From a paper:
In particular, the β-d-galacto configured cyclopentylamine bearing a 4-bromobenzyl moiety at the nitrogen (15), has been found to excel in terms of inhibitory activity and recently prepared compounds 16 and 17 are powerful inhibitors of human lysosomal β-galactosidase and potent pharmacological chaperones for the R201C mutant of this enzyme. For all the C-1-substituents in 1, 16, 17 and 31, (an NH-octyl group in 1 and 16, and NH-C6-NH-dansyl groups in 17 and 31), and the C-5a-substituted NH-C6-NH-dansyl groups in 14 and 22, there are very few interactions between the protein and substituted derivative moieties. The most salient variation in hydrogen bonding occurs at the 2-OH group, which is present in 1, 16 and 17. The group is tethered by interactions with ND2 Asn204 (all 2.8–3.0 Å) and to both OE atoms of Glu349 (2.6–2.7 Å) Hydrogen bonding patterns for 16 and 17 are very similar, despite the different groups bound at C-1, which are probably flexible and show few polar interactions with the protein, and not surprisingly, the Ki values determined for these inhibitors with recombinant human lysosomal β-Gal are very similar. Another key ligand-protein interaction is displayed for compounds 1, 16, 17 and 31, which feature hydrogen bonding interactions from their amine groups at ring position 1 to Glu205 (2.6–2.8 Å) and with a water which is also hydrogen bonded to ND2 Asn135, and in the case of 1, to the C-4 hydroxyl group.
Residue numbers in the entry: 36 to 436, 439 to 575
Write the structure that this text describes.
Amino acid sequence: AAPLPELLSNNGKHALMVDGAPYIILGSQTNNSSNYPDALKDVWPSMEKMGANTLSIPVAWEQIEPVEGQFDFSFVDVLLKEARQRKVRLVLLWFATWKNNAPHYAPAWVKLDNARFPRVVKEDGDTLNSLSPLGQNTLAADKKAFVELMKYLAKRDKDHTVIMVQVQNEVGTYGAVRDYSPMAQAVFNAAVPDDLIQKLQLKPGTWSQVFGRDADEFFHAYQIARYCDEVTVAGKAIKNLPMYVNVALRNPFNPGLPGQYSSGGGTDNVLHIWKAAAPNIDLIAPDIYFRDYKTVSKVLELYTRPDNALFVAEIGNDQPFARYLFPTLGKGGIGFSPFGMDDTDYTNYPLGAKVYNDETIEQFAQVYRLVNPMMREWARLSYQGQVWGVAEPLDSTTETQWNAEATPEEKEQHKKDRASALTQQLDLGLWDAEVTYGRPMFWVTPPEGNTPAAGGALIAQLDDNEYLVTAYKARVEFKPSQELAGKKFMIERVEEGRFEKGKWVMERVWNGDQTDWGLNFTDRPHLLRVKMASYSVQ
Ligand SMILES: CCCCCCCCN[C@H]1[C@H](O)[C@@H](O)[C@@H](O)[C@H]1CO
Ligand code: NA
Ligand code: NA
Ligand code: NA
Ligand code: NA
């Protein structure tokens, strides 16, 4: 009965439709070795503590086809049953031809048979442990197994507990830019396919001729993109679920060279190749392990496009990362999924939290508690209207802030500069919001930031003068956007409340102290409807 999940894109906005309405993945992803029935008891408690609505978890080629033609979906059976018992949804991660550039999750009969399923050859003739996207046997084998997984979901997942599939994991190659095998050179030292030369507005020729100094990297990205599109089409012909690829990001400011980063993945410089080569892949999702605000903000900008829904398919699970939920959703993002949210005795520190404990989880639970009570309403406003979101824009001071060695004039100057940086403006049409971080709930002492950095805010427009507002360790203040020609302005009314059956239910009116000094949020959840008014005095 249930309509298929679908990614919609209209008027440069996006929605992930689940059960016929926009949905936000408030996600969690397991560690990489939790894809087994015995591991799930170490997954669910963290997911319930986090309040996540969707679990991302691997389904490995080596586990569903351990002997060629001998399929085993015993894990998928247990996973679907246990997800449904907990009323959560699933994103399955197809670990196959590539998992972090390598074939470690391909069956032994694949990854130990280089002649049938061939590896990238470097220019010097050394071989890398990265399967070539020009291996036709490898493409056929991956596609065949992925089709069998999709047939399992077609037959056994009629209500779409699984809402989306990631095809491969962090594709590309470390250690070279492309395959330089004889097989690969015969394709490289030849015409660029008609279809790519058209989609990019370029002149006919060989890879070297039309792309020059980008030929090696664009060639790898196109061939991988084509490989992933073919797997994707084969699977969607069985069940047309949304499907996506995740990116082992290059640093957007100082990337270095392809092969230092994972060459051929959907890095920012080849998104045009990926979009032209792989029209069947719904979106290209960034995997975010940069901790600093400016780099993360740049990633969110680069991956949010009229042709690309923003899904933060992975993000580090350390404390600093939780606040990026707010700009992700403010960009119209469809979801956010911290990595390593299970108690299987692993942490990917230095990428994530040094320690995995209930405090680690709580940093994400606290932000999820702001969005879960309005998730369907937010998702619709994000698609059909105007939303905004911001995070605290200074990172935690390093055990260095050099700050103490500064002079006592350099210091008041430091404090004014920090207060300015911790003050964000948002243009909401007739009204602006100013968001500030780390100050009392009364009076106007300048902001000093939270320790550690943690704050954020979400705003959705309900009407010309009315906004839905929730924020965290932050003050939000409204003002007129344009000079008012004689008129004055006030807050007309602030209500705290909730949605029941899609209707607003008031709990209380914020007024007095609670609205004299902006709208002040701590760690606790409050959903507000704010109505502003200009009024005549003359
Ligand atoms: C700031 C520098 C970050 C560079 C390292 C990024 C690689 C990130 N790889 C991610 C994969 O998609 C996951 O399966 C898992 O392996 C994860 C890392 O725990
Ligand atoms: Na959206
Ligand atoms: Na305006
Ligand atoms: Na304005
Ligand atoms: Na409330």
